[PDB]
Amino acid sequence: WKKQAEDIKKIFEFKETLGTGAFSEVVLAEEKATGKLFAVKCIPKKALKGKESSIENEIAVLRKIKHENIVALEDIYESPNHLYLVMQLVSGGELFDRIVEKGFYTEKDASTLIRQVLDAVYYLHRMGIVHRDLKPENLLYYSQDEESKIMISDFGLSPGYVAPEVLAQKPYSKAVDCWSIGVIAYILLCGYPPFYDENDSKLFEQILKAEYEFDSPYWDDISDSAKDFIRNLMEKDPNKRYTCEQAARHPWIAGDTALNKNIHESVSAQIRKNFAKMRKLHLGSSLD
Ligand SMILES: NC(=O)c1cnc(N2CCC[C@H](N)C2)nc1Nc1cccc(C(F)(F)F)c1
């Protein structure tokens, strides 16, 4: 390792808050010496009182990992009261915004997104890292290009997306990441979270018992292969739950069972209900 700074503000100009959690905040910051922009995760040291050593081991591994679909941890700074994770800035745009504005959106688009997420988390699991906070807001596009890759853009060093065994207060595993990927896939195909209720206590019971359905009519035009894929990831028993490597082989990801039907109308309509907000000329540039 951690670089030392008496005043982190001598190194970075903090410009814009990007997200605030219970124990950290990510801020868009400019390296004063270079003008380069980064996403700096600011962590108060008091929040890490229970197990500083495990966080130190995790960040040390994160510094060495490198993956297409994972933000790079470029540096670690330390002040008397804070830890600063200097992350690569992903400015391509948010996942749900992109889908709403698309106009044409299919299972193949959703499968392409999940395929990248599966590969990134599989790699993380191979390196001994459990992400623990996989959710749509942590997925950002690398660039504005329509074919841009998606990127896991934040880390969960510390209820709708969390696995039942976590709610049961059972010990975490890599399997909790796989459950979360299944929840992301569910939302990508219908636009609403699999578990909801006005009463928080009844919502807890529904997640704990894994009570969800592929509700009509929203799922009527979704392929059976996609539902089978989600079922194996959103499996209550972690002993029976798909691994990332298993899910990557499923025909919905690795094969051709993902449909090309335009589901944008229903999916974007549900997203708005649940989440608050190259041109080529024929025989000219088309011949590339
Ligand atoms: N790795 C990152 O670049 C990055 C990390 N964390 C975050 N969040 C915000 C979403 C929630 C998450 N737990 C922390 N958002 C990032 N970036 C981001 C977000 C919005 C807008 C822009 C900007 F390009 F317009 F500036 C960048």
Which residue has the least CA distance to atom 23 on ligand 1? 91
Same domain, 80 and 190: no
Q: How far is CA 182 from the centre of its chain?
A: 11
Cα 236 to Cα 231: distance, rounded to the nearest angstrom:
9
In contact, 134 and 121? CB cutoff 8 Å: yes
Q: Kindly state whether residues 36 and 174 are assigned to the same domain.
A: no
Could you identify the residue written with the tokens 């807890």? 204
Q: How far apart are the first and last CA of the chain?
A: 47
H/E segment holding residue 248: helix 244-249
DSSP one-letter string for 120-168: HHHHHHHTT-------GGGEEESSSSTTPPEEE-------TTS-HHHHT
Contact (Cβ atoms closer than 8 angstroms) between residue 39 and residue 153: yes
Note whether residue 282 is domain-resident. no
* Total of domains in the chain: 2
Sheet of 3-4, strands arranged across = 3-4, 73-78, 82-87, 37-44, 25-31, 12-20
Three-state DSSP class for residue 191: coil
Residue ranges of the annotated binding site for ATP are 18-26, 41
Could you tell me if 23 and 7 are in contact, meaning their C-beta atoms sit under 8 angstroms apart?
Answer: no
Indicate whether 195 and 211 sit together in one domain.
yes
Q: Is residue 274 part of a domain?
A: no
Write the CB contacts of 23 (distance below 8 Å, at least 6 apart in sequence): 43, 44, 47, 48, 157, 158
Residue 72's domain is classified under what CATH number? 3.30.200.20
199 occurs within a structural domain? yes
In this structure, what are the phi and psi dihedrals at residue 20, rounded to the nearest 5 degrees? -125, 125
Is 30 a domain residue? yes
- Would you say residue 69 lies in a domain? yes
182: in domain: yes
Other beta carbons less than 10 A from residue 273's beta carbon: 10
Contact 232, 246 (CB under 8 A): yes
Helix (H/G/I), strand (E/B), else coil: 78: strand
Please give the resolution of this entry in Å, rounded to 1 decimal. Answer: 2.0
DSSP-derived letter for residue 197 is -
- Residue 139 Cα, ligand 1 centroid: separation in angstroms? 9
The residues lining ligand 1, judged by C-beta closer than 6 Å to any ligand atom, are 18-19, 26, 28, 39, 71, 87-91, 137-138, 140, 153-154
Among 76, 81, 77, 109, CA closest to 95: 109
Domain ranges, residue 133: 90-253
Q: How far is CA 44 from the centre of its chain?
A: 23
| Domain identity same for 43 and 163 | no
Atom of ligand 1 nearest to the CA of 151: 1
What is the b/e burial string over 63-91, where b = at least 16 CB atoms within 10 angstroms of the residue's CB? eeeebebbbebbbbbebeebbbbbbbbbe
Residues 160 and 237 in one domain: yes
Q: Are residues 110 and 221 in the same domain?
A: yes
Task: Specify whether 8 is located in the same domain as 151.
Answer: no
CA distances from 86 to 55, 59, 75, 76, 138 (A): 15, 11, 5, 6, 16
Q: Technique behind this structure?
A: X-ray
